[PDB]
């Protein structure tokens, strides 16, 4: 009866930057939260470890999760390639929101984004399922390698990840 806490250790060109901890709202979106949790432990044989943040736009968000093609076209869920939009109870209310990227209605795989600002235009379209619990300062340092068009100037990698609780 406790929401999982997951962590990512971020590296910039192999150099360790720090740890970001996330609280996953398994009490509101159990199946989206579980997908993210299991991809962070790597327990199904595949996951986030070693993958990158392929698209970062300062003031907007940091996008990652494509562990198969590393460019925005791949990734899959623990349920098969894609799964449904569970619900839209939570909104993109400010910095630190963790939400799912997609290619339209009911197309969730493994790609996600961490909001750097309130992005109310994404409400009802992207499922919010967690928030940054510790290390928002590491996300702010990550944005500095992003650009208006999303290209990063440095390789931002998840060097390790797992579950803390």
């Amino acid at each position: 009866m406790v929401n999982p806490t997951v962590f990512f250790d971020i590296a910039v060109d192999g150099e360790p930057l720090g740890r970001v901890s996330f609280e996953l709202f398994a009490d509101k979106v159990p199946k989206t939260a579980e997908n993210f949790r299991a991809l962070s432990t790597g327990e199904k044989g595949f996951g986030y470890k070693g993958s990158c943040f392929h698209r970062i736009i300062p003031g907007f968000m940091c996008q990652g999760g494509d562990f198969t093609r590393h460019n925005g076209t791949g990734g899959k869920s623990i349920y098969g390639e894609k799964f449904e939009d569970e619900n839209f109870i939570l909104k993109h209310t400010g910095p630190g929101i963790l939400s799912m990227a997609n290619a339209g209605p009911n197309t969730n795989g493994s790609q996600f984004f961490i909001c750097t600002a309130k992005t109310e235009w994404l409400d009802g379209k992207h499922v919010v399922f967690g928030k940054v619990k510790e290390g928002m300062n590491i996300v702010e340092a990550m944005e500095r390698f992003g650009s208006r068009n999303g290209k990063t100037s440095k390789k931002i990698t998840i060097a390790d990840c797992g579950q803390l609780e």
Binding site: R55, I57, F60, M61, Q63, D66, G72, T73, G75, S99, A101, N102, A103, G104, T107, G109, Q111, F113, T119, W121, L122, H126, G150
Partner: peptide, 11 residues
């Protein structure tokens, strides 16, 4: 513009 998609990214 400022969207978050997987595959065809929009302006």
């Amino acid at each position: 513009x400022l969207l978050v998609x997987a595959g065809l990214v929009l302006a």
